[PDB]
Amino acid sequence: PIRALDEGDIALLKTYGQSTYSRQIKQVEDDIQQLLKKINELTGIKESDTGLAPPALWDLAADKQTLQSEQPLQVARCTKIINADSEDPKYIINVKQFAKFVVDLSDQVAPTDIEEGMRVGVDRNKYQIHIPLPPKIDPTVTMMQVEEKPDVTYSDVGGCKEQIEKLREVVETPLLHPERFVNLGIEPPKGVLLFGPPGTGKTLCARAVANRTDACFIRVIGSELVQKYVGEGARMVRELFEMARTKKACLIFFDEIDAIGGARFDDGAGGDNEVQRTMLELINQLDGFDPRGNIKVLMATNRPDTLDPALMRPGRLDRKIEFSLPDLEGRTHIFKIHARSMSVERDIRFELLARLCPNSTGAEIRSVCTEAGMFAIRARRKIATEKDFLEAVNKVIKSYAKFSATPRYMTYN
Amino acid sequence: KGVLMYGPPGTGKTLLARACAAQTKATFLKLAGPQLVQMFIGDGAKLVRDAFALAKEKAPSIIFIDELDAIGTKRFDSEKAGDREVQRTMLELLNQLDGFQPNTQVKVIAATNRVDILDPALLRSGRLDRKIEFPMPNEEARARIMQIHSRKMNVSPDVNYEELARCTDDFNGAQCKAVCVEAGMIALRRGATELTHEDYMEGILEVQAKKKANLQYYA
Amino acid sequence: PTRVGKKKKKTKGPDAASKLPLVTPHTQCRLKLLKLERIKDYLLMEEEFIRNQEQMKPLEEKQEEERSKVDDLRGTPMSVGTLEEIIDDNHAIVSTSVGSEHYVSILSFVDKDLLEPGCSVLLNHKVHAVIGVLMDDTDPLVTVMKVEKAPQETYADIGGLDNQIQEIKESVELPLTHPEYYEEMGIKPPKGVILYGPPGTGKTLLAKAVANQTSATFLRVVGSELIQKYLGDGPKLVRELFRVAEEHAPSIVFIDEIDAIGTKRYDSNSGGEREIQRTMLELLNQLDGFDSRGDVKVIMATNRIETLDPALIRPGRIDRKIEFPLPDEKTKKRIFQIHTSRMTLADDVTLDDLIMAKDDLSGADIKAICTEAGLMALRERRMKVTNEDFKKSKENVLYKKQEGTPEGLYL
Amino acid sequence: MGEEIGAEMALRTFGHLLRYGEPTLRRAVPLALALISVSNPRLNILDTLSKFSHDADPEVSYNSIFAMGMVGSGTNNARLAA
Amino acid sequence: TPNCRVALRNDSYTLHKILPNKVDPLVSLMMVEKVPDSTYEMIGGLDKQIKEIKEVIELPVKHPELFEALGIAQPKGVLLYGPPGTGKTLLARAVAHHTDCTFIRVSGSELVQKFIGEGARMVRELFVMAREHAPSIIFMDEIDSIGSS
Numbered sequence A: 001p002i003r004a005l006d007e008g009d010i011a012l013l014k015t016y017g018q019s020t021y022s023r024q025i026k027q028v029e030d031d032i033q034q035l036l037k038k039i040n041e042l043t044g045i046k047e048s049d050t051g052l053a054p055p056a057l058w059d060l061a062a063d064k065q066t067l068q069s070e071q072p073l074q075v076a077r078c079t080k081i082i083n084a085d086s087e088d089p090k091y092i093i094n095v096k097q098f099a100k101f102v103v104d105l106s107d108q109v110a111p112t113d114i115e116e117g118m119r120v121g122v123d124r125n126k127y128q129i130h131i132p133l134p135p136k137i138d139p140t141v142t143m144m145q146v147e148e149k150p151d152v153t154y155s156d157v158g159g160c161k162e163q164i165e166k167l168r169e170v171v172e173t174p175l176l177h178p179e180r181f182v183n184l185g186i187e188p189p190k191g192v193l194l195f196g197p198p199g200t201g202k203t204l205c206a207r208a209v210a211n212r213t214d215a216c217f218i219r220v221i222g223s224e225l226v227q228k229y230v231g232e233g234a235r236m237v238r239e240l241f242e243m244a245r246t247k248k249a250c251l252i253f254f255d256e257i258d259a260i261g262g263a264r265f266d267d268g269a270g271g272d273n274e275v276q277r278t279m280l281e282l283i284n285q286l287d288g289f290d291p292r293g294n295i296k297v298l299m300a301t302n303r304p305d306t307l308d309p310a311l312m313r314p315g316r317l318d319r320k321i322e323f324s325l326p327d328l329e330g331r332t333h334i335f336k337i338h339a340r341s342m343s344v345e346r347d348i349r350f351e352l353l354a355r356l357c358p359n360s361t362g363a364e365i366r367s368v369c370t371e372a373g374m375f376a377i378r379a380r381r382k383i384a385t386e387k388d389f390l391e392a393v394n395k396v397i398k399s400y401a402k403f404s405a406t407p408r409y410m411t412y413n
Numbered sequence B: 001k002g003v004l005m006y007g008p009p010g011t012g013k014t015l016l017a018r019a020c021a022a023q024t025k026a027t028f029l030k031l032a033g034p035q036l037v038q039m040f041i042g043d044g045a046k047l048v049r050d051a052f053a054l055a056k057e058k059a060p061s062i063i064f065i066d067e068l069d070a071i072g073t074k075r076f077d078s079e080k081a082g083d084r085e086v087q088r089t090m091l092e093l094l095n096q097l098d099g100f101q102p103n104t105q106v107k108v109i110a111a112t113n114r115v116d117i118l119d120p121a122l123l124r125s126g127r128l129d130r131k132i133e134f135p136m137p138n139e140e141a142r143a144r145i146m147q148i149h150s151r152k153m154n155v156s157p158d159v160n161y162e163e164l165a166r167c168t169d170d171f172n173g174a175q176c177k178a179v180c181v182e183a184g185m186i187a188l189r190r191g192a193t194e195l196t197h198e199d200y201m202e203g204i205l206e207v208q209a210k211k212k213a214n215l216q217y218y219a
Numbered sequence C: 001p002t003r004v005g006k007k008k009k010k011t012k013g014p015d016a017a018s019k020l021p022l023v024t025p026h027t028q029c030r031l032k033l034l035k036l037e038r039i040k041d042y043l044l045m046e047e048e049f050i051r052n053q054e055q056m057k058p059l060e061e062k063q064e065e066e067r068s069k070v071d072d073l074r075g076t077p078m079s080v081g082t083l084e085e086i087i088d089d090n091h092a093i094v095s096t097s098v099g100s101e102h103y104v105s106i107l108s109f110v111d112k113d114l115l116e117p118g119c120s121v122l123l124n125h126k127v128h129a130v131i132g133v134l135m136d137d138t139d140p141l142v143t144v145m146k147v148e149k150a151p152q153e154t155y156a157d158i159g160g161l162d163n164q165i166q167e168i169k170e171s172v173e174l175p176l177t178h179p180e181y182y183e184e185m186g187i188k189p190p191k192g193v194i195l196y197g198p199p200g201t202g203k204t205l206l207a208k209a210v211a212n213q214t215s216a217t218f219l220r221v222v223g224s225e226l227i228q229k230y231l232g233d234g235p236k237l238v239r240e241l242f243r244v245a246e247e248h249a250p251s252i253v254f255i256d257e258i259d260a261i262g263t264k265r266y267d268s269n270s271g272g273e274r275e276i277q278r279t280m281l282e283l284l285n286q287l288d289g290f291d292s293r294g295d296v297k298v299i300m301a302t303n304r305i306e307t308l309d310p311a312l313i314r315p316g317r318i319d320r321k322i323e324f325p326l327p328d329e330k331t332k333k334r335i336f337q338i339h340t341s342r343m344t345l346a347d348d349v350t351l352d353d354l355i356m357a358k359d360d361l362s363g364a365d366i367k368a369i370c371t372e373a374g375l376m377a378l379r380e381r382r383m384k385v386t387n388e389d390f391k392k393s394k395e396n397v398l399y400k401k402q403e404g405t406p407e408g409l410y411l
Numbered sequence D: 001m002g003e004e005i006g007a008e009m010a011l012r013t014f015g016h017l018l019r020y021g022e023p024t025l026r027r028a029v030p031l032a033l034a035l036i037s038v039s040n041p042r043l044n045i046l047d048t049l050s051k052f053s054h055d056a057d058p059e060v061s062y063n064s065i066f067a068m069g070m071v072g073s074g075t076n077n078a079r080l081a082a
Numbered sequence E: 001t002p003n004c005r006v007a008l009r010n011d012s013y014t015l016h017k018i019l020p021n022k023v024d025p026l027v028s029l030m031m032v033e034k035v036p037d038s039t040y041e042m043i044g045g046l047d048k049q050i051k052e053i054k055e056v057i058e059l060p061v062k063h064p065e066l067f068e069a070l071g072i073a074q075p076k077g078v079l080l081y082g083p084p085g086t087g088k089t090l091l092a093r094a095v096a097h098h099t100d101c102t103f104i105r106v107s108g109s110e111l112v113q114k115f116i117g118e119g120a121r122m123v124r125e126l127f128v129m130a131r132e133h134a135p136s137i138i139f140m141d142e143i144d145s146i147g148s149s
């Protein structure tokens, strides 16, 4: 028995209570939002100006020479040559996208420098060779040659006095003393994997050897190997393992090789097929016929269990350096690294702080050092006290690691 | 005319085929698995057939194919191309291999690590047929290989490789090579001039990445 | 040199909204009639001044003969190409979309200083010649995720969360407004923030209030937004996402519902599962992997937190974990007070009737109670809202959550 | 959309409107100052450099002025505006 | 408009006309053209249930200024539940016969397709197509599918 609407009762509502300023305030807000629009299309000042030089230098070119470089200039294409025959051109030339022609040389060429597999400038009408080219270099390995120093010294990787000692043996020592390996009769390993918990210092050891290398170092973006086209990712592998053979002793660092292939299965007849072709091409240019010589490979992962046993074989990855948690002497050295460059009280002790971080990483220790200064900005201070750090330990660890054991603690004292 | 190698992936499949290319002069033709996959349409069957016509021009030429399971997969139907050029590269391998009579001169060698990817009914009769499996080294074959790679070092002559095969178990041929490499550098740590049985035992634990403390149970 | 390239010559475009967020009478008063008419005065004059600006221009030279022939020198159907290599004899090599590569010349007025293999250029059809170079080259999927409007009200809109309001301000607003405190201790501000808790608590509001009161730009990402099917299209959009944020202002990125972007990184049997899992593994790389980061902040939000990948929860990536619990009997008063701002409230009601008697319900429950009780007044022909509206509304909203847990075992 | 009115003189509003400082206008002026637009008698735009710092109550604005002073030693000639 | 099709002359690549009816190959199922469906009064005995739907659908569309003057946000969510065979789908078709509005029918099981990512994004393309017909009602069939847990 509840119904309360009828068109006459609609006219009750919108006249009761501020009949003076109801529409008087509303349409002012309405047409100003219309006026927000009508300013915008009246401006219209987008101005995507690009391509043009400063207009004080090209004046000589675009007087007649630009008109002189329309009709006499050529729109010739570049191609590749298969071979040649004797006494004549008989040149067999492909495009790999267009067809394959058999054409003649032109007048402006020397018939000696028409060697096979050479990029050559080809006419559009009669398709004659005009200009030979320098060979093609791969465009994306140039993008990932680092050419840049990240600034991390070995004095910042504290807590790892022995993991650096294993890593010093493989990378640095044959590149500076290639004598004692031969003068005793051994060979250095050529592949090192890094595995362990996250935030432990995997990237730091890779970032610090890019500082002190004195050699070719190549970061490799992992998901550039995965492409849209079939077989394209496998071709990217090849160009990487050719130019490494040209120069001597270049370093290649992969990172998170969990992504580029971890297991080879087929039960539902399909899946990560194209990823396997790129991943198996990586294997055959790692071991197989034509061993690589002086190419050192570094890999790092967080989930080492799910990797292919084809990569777990030594000869491809030879040293298994793992990272663990620093016991106590490691952590007391880590606090002195991450808190030396901050305004603290000059009398505090750090060994009491290293107690209260039992199962912690180097990332978690630095988060305590940053958070303790944030409490100093909650108050109005410019130096850190002891209780600033003690509240920071409870904020980082104890706010997430335990909630039942701290209040109801009376089983342990 | 068809020989297939299979087994666990550390036994020496590639290591065996390099020696056959070494001592024989009969125009060895290496070929990898994922080399036949190309981006444009129909290019792999060009690359399959031209190399087989090349190896037919030379009489004694024999062909090695590594990771045949890179293309030798259970073929599945689709609607967005994808694998629908690989079988045209696969069947061209199947058409050419049945294309000529089995007169021994162009013997073909293949080798995979996992059998369960390959197409078993597609070989079975006159295709890749001979099964040469590579098992793991038993006891003395481990002690033989560790003696092979230790030929080039200063080994003190109180080391029995049979005593090493006591503690080394379930290893392939490459992990036996890895013990031999790591033991040379442990002696390099303390600057030792020759090796010892203790030097190998620490090199064993480094392969599977172990370490030992004082465990306070053991007096 | 010391100042190589002077950092990409690039300005920043922030928002144009928030013209005048001062309507502070908040009721039918003549002040808001007076204030908005002032806003009408300035925008009409801004219209009429620029109307006079395009009117009284007797300057015509067009381009003093230089750019006018140049605009006729270039073709009218201007096309788009791609550099492969640079042969610097004013005759370079390019690549089309199909891969047809042409030994084209450089037809001038282009400085050979900002063209790199990968930078897209402008070409002709009759001679295919390089006329200009295409700039900014953004794929139109990331420009959709660029917010231009401040949607809702400021921090005074939400009903009291001040312990956790001061947390997010320490990492977003305060380092950008006043970074003089941090250099005195050399401490970089935190980067990543997780908002987690039960649903209906205020996660989406806290991002919108930050996007209202800010100075840098803003980017929103709705969950499964960076997921495609072309096996490399997934991780490629993530690179362009952080590229745009880095090239523009020192701004923040809000990626919401990251429970569909991470679960513990296990390996399994499905092939479409991996292009899911791989895109979500290189977001890890762009965030706190190699090189550096720039001034890019990331704010993430879920309902459940334990089903996430532990590689994302670690510090270095995310330094703040913020709980949003269900409210109390004190700040709940502020929820009822704000959502009953502009409604005709009868004097019979007591706000503490429904608060103290029942002690379970979210902030989004309270907005539904205020709207339902207003519907009950029109349901029985009223303008003012009494206690009897809230008696029926507190019933009707809460009957969507089940009866109970266990019987009286505990005592 | 100006000429001599805008690109010579119209920044003295911000040197007259407030002296408190807030990053809306404090960042909008180096949009037209880092772009010096040197084709004019640039001390017009460098006059707009001068009372861009016409905001009192000392701030973190040292990041702008010292970095523009670094490009302002060699370029933006020290004969005129050092 | 950005992301809008135009007519391009093949003569000199000059623009010719803005082309409406933007790219959407999957609104065959949505926005049913004809409604000679059932009527409003043959529901017969659900009057408490029917009048609540007027409050949430008819009333904000017909008279939005009431919620302005009263000072509350307007509701937008409706859930219908019960045992099977209790008039759940007539009430969809009875509203759709009398809505004077755009009616977008979505059954609750075609949002999976077969490829990951495109099985999702058309839901985002669904609702942004509802901005074109600016008043609209979108209906769900049988959410015991996607939306479970």
Ligand SMILES: Nc1ncnc2c1ncn2[C@@H]1O[C@H](COP(=O)(O)OP(=O)(O)OP(=O)(O)O)[C@@H](O)[C@H]1O
Residues within 6 Å of the ligand: A156, A157, A158, A159, A160, A197, A198, A199, A200, A201, A202, A203, A204, A301, A302, A334, A337, A361, A362, A363, A364, A366, C288, C311, C316
């Ligand atoms: N042993 C250490 N000494 C000093 N600082 C450390 C150490 N380990 C980690 N850190 C600090 O933790 C931060 C994060 O470490 P990092 O990201 O390199 O760990 P990771 O193992 O590479 O992580 P992931 O496994 O996810 O790649 C570093 O910036 C570093 O400052």
Ligand SMILES: Nc1ncnc2c1ncn2[C@@H]1O[C@H](COP(=O)(O)OP(=O)(O)OP(=O)(O)O)[C@@H](O)[C@H]1O
Residues within 6 Å of the ligand: A287, A288, A310, A315, B008, B009, B010, B011, B012, B013, B014, B015, B016, B112, B113, B145, B148, B172, B173, B174, B175, B177
């Ligand atoms: N029986 C053996 N005698 C001597 N050396 C061996 C033997 N087995 C393995 N090795 C050593 O181990 C390495 C592994 O051999 P190989 O390179 O053939 O790998 P593989 O078993 O073919 O791997 P995959 O099958 O995965 O390709 C060789 O380099 C070789 O030095």
Ligand SMILES: Nc1ncnc2c1ncn2[C@@H]1O[C@H](COP(=O)(O)OP(=O)(O)OP(=O)(O)O)[C@@H](O)[C@H]1O
Residues within 6 Å of the ligand: C157, C158, C159, C160, C161, C198, C199, C200, C201, C202, C203, C204, C205, C206, C302, C303, C335, C338, C363, C364, C367
């Ligand atoms: N503390 C609060 N003060 C005022 N209003 C609130 C508060 N918390 C929630 N609300 C109400 O809740 C709505 C916002 O929802 P909220 O931000 O909680 O979504 P959410 O947390 O993202 O939910 P979900 O996690 O389910 O997506 C707003 O309409 C607002 O009116």
Ligand SMILES: Nc1ncnc2c1ncn2[C@@H]1O[C@H](COP(=O)(O)OP(=O)(O)OP(=O)(O)O)[C@@H](O)[C@H]1O
Residues within 6 Å of the ligand: E042, E043, E044, E045, E083, E084, E085, E086, E087, E088, E089, E090, E091, E142
């Ligand atoms: N109150 C009613 N008056 C008239 N016809 C009804 C009534 N209730 C159900 N029906 C009949 O039931 C059929 C419609 O089914 P309904 O709308 O109940 O879907 P439903 O059965 O709830 O959906 P489901 O099968 O998924 O439960 C029509 O034939 C309709 O005539």
Ligand SMILES: [Mg+2]
Residues within 6 Å of the ligand: A202, A203, A204, C289
């Ligand atoms: Mg790392």
Ligand SMILES: [Mg+2]
Residues within 6 Å of the ligand: A288, B013, B014, B015, B066
């Ligand atoms: Mg092999």
Ligand SMILES: [Mg+2]
Residues within 6 Å of the ligand: C203, C204
């Ligand atoms: Mg939310």
Ligand SMILES: [Mg+2]
Residues within 6 Å of the ligand: E088, E089
């Ligand atoms: Mg039904």
